[PDB]
Amino acid sequence: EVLFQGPMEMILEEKDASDWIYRGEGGANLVLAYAGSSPLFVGKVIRIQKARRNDKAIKNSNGVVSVLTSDEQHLWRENNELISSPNKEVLEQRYVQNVIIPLLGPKHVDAGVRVSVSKEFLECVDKKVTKQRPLWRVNAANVDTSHDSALILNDHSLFSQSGGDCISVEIKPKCGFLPTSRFIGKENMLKTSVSRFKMHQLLKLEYIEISEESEYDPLDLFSGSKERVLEAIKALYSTPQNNFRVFLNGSLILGGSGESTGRTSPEIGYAFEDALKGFIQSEDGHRTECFLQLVSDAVYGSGVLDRLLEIQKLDKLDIEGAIHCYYDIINQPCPICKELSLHALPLDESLKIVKEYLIAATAKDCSIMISFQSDYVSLKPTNQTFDYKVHFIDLSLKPLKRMESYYKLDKKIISFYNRKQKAE
Ligand SMILES: O=P(O)(O)O[C@H]1[C@H](OP(=O)(O)O)[C@@H](OP(=O)(O)O)[C@H](OP(=O)(O)O)[C@@H](OP(=O)(O)O)[C@H]1OP(=O)(O)O
Ligand SMILES: Nc1ncnc2c1ncn2[C@@H]1O[C@H](COP(=O)(O)OP(=O)(O)O)[C@@H](O)[C@H]1O
Ligand SMILES: [Mg+2]
Ligand SMILES: [Zn+2]
């Protein structure tokens, strides 16, 4: 018998920063994979929240940096724990656990485990990975070194703890339905027949954020038709932008690193066809088409997109309707109106509409990771069998204040799209 230390919460210190390497980033978070040997962290990633360089901290009426605004505290009040969260990491944990998982189900979703971190750990991590980051990401934001916590997650690009290579695919599917809202005016009619994703591509192109419009159409992927699902995967492969990434054993072999990337050219195709050597048994020039059928069969077979789309549809009125409830919620005179129905609703209904809008925004912006290992898919072509797992990531809580930005962006997108279409 040997005396062990009592339980003690893990704290990442300056020295541990060298054990973590850049995996990627979205707008709000940086993600690092563990490169060490400690059993606590093998097969895990750490998720670190970023801070925009200009942003002023949220403070309550006593001037204390706080997690939620009073408005958000009221919007999310249905769950006592969630609105009590003492920091941003707990907030995200309880959001996923208490809001999303009751809607999406626990099989494909994990709220993550919190770990304490020193200011110096975050500063060194910030320093170490700068050279890996897209320069425009660096311009905009860095690690938030005021945080005392981060989130540990399972590394989905590894089908690990024996099984050989693991090819994982990340899909960022965006919004899969067209609005029917009565609050969309006749000048904005094209919103009821052309996906947000398609219209946004044109604006992204105008701002030189992409080199070409994507071939991907979310309506295909969310169609529930195996044949249209396959067409979406082929589209994502052709123009990955920031919607499609492939990893071999955790290393990126297709798609961008922390950003969108250009169309898959013949040469990128060759490298990727070579990268599938062994994983798929096929004669040179046919592995990738087998690979895309594999991905397609796993997306369609799992049906994870069905329940995700019902949550996206919690955006029932479109931002053009929901923006009016927003201004009622915070008791500000509506600048959109110059209405009834929406403004005559009881406060509780307005709150509900806005809360469901923000839940729907979470669902329109998350990603799916599907890892494969030789729940299984077998390809009718080459006669192989692959186990696979599916996992959601980036089911993040959106700030209530963003309703104003959502309305302004939406107005920008449809305005520009109309101008373009009117050029005949
Ligand atoms: O920076 P990008 O790679 O272009 O991605 C962003 C980002 O999504 P990620 O969190 O997945 O990176 C935004 O979310 P934040 O990170 O800033 O919270 C999101 O904004 P919303 O979810 O608030 O809408 C926005 O989506 P959208 O453009 O639909 O508003 C989306 O941009 P794209 O997916 O269009 O590139
Ligand atoms: N649990 C995970 N396992 C493996 N890779 C992940 C995991 N979480 C995130 N990533 C990778 O890191 C990237 C950024 O993560 P994400 O949380 O989407 O950033 P943000 O929250 O800023 O949108 C993703 O595009 C994905 O490739
Ligand atoms: Mg995010
Ligand atoms: Zn109004």
In the 3-class helix/strand/coil scheme, how is 266-320 assigned residue by residue?
HHHHHHHHHHCECCECCCCCCHHHHHHHHHHHHHHHHCHHHHHHHHHCCCCCHHH
Residue 227 makes CB contacts below 8 A (sequence gap 6+) with none
Q: Which helix (H) or strand (E) holds 115?
A: strand 113-117
**C-alpha–C-alpha distance, residues 72 and 38, integer Å:** 39
Both tokens of residue 184?
A: 């969309």
Q: Are 207 and 97 in the same domain?
A: no
Bridge partners, 229 (sequence order): none
What resolution in angstrom units was achieved for this structure? 2.0
Examine the domain organization and report whether 65 and 152 are in the same domain. Answer: yes
Confirm if 283 and 328 have CB atoms less than 8 A apart. Answer: no
User: Does 92 contact ligand 2 (Cβ within 6 A)?
Assistant: no
Q: Within this chain, do residues 196 and 265 fall inside the same structural domain, yes or no?
A: yes
Q: Is the minimum distance from the CB of 110 to ligand 2 under 6 angstroms?
A: no
Q: Which atom of ligand 2 is nearest to the CA of 172?
A: 25
CB atoms within 10 A of CB 93: 21
Residues 279 and 386 in one domain: yes
Same domain, 309 and 326: yes
Tokens read off for 176: 């899969």
Around 49, how many Cα atoms within 13 Å sit in the side-chain half-sphere? 22
| Ligand 1 atom with the shortest distance to the CA of 27 | 16
Tell me how far apart the alpha carbons of residues 376 and 227 are, in angstroms, rounded to a whole number.
19
Q: Which one of the ligands is nearest to 362 CA?
A: 1
User: Which secondary structure element, helix H or strand E, spans residue 22, and what is its range?
Assistant: strand 20-25
Domain assignment of residue 313, given as a range = 166-424
Among 165, 184, 208, the domain-final residue is: 165
Q: Which residue has the tokens 């082929």?
A: 234
Q: Considering only CA atoms, which of 73, 106, 112, 72 is closest in space to residue 89?
A: 112
* In a shared domain, residues 285 and 359: yes
Which is nearest to 379 in space by CA: 294, 265, 264, 271?
Answer: 294
Amino acid at 37: S
- Are 348 and 359 contained in the same domain? yes
What is the β-pairing status of strands 141-143 and 244-248? unpaired
- The terminus-to-terminus CA distance of the chain in angstroms comes to 84
Domain count, the chain: 2
Pair of tokens at residue 127: 């320093």
Q: Among 198, 182, 181, 180, which Cα is nearest to 414's?
A: 198
**Domain finish residue from 165, 195, 222:** 165
- Per DSSP, the three-state class of 96 is helix
From residue 258, how far is each of 131, 272, 321, 340 by CA, in Å?
12, 19, 33, 44
Final residue in a domain of this structure, among 165, 186, 218:
165
Residues 217 and 266 in one domain: yes
Instruction: Based on the fold, state whether residues 116 and 213 are members of the same structural domain.
Output: no
Q: Given the DSSP bridges, would you call strands 367-373 and 44-52 parallel, antiparallel or unpaired?
A: unpaired
Residue nearest atom 19 of ligand 2, based on CA coordinates: 26
The 3-state DSSP class for residue 163 equals coil
Structure tokens at 190: 């094209």
Do 192 and 130 share a structural domain? Answer: no
Which DSSP string do the residues of 319-377 spell out, in sequence order? HHHHHHHHHHHTT---SS----GGGGS-HHHHHHHHHHHHHHHHHHS-EEEEEEE--EE
Looking at the DSSP bridge assignments, the partners of residue 385 are 378
Strand ranges of the sheet holding 244-248, from the earlier edge strand across to the other edge: 251-254, 244-248, 167-171, 367-373, 384-393, 376-379
Taking residue 302's Cβ as centre, other Cβ atoms within 10 Å add up to 18
Q: What is the helix (H) or strand (E) element at residue 30, kind and residue range?
A: strand 29-34
Same domain, 97 and 223: no
List the one residue out of 405, 396, 399, 415 whose CA is nearest residue 49: 396
Domain co-membership, 93 together with 187: no
Q: Which ligand is nearest to the CA of 393?
A: 2
Which of 256, 269, 77, 253 lies closest to 157 in space, CA to CA? 253
User: Which residues neighbour 261 within 8 Å (Cβ) at sequence distance 6 or greater?
Assistant: 240, 241, 242, 255
Length in residues, the chain: 424
Please tell me if the CB atom of residue 153 comes closer than 6 angstroms to any atom of ligand 2: yes
Q: What is the DSSP letter of 241?
A: B
R_g (Cα) of the chain, nearest Å: 23
CATH number of the CATH domain containing 57: 3.30.200.110
316/24 Cα distance (integer angstroms):
33
CB 114 within 8 A of CB 133: no
How far does residue 414's CA lie from ligand 4's centre (Å)?
19
> Measured from the CB, is residue 28 less than 6 Å from ligand 1?
yes
Q: What is the DSSP letter of 107?
A: T
Two tokens at 209?
A: 């954020």
C-beta separation of 33 from 21 below 8 A: yes
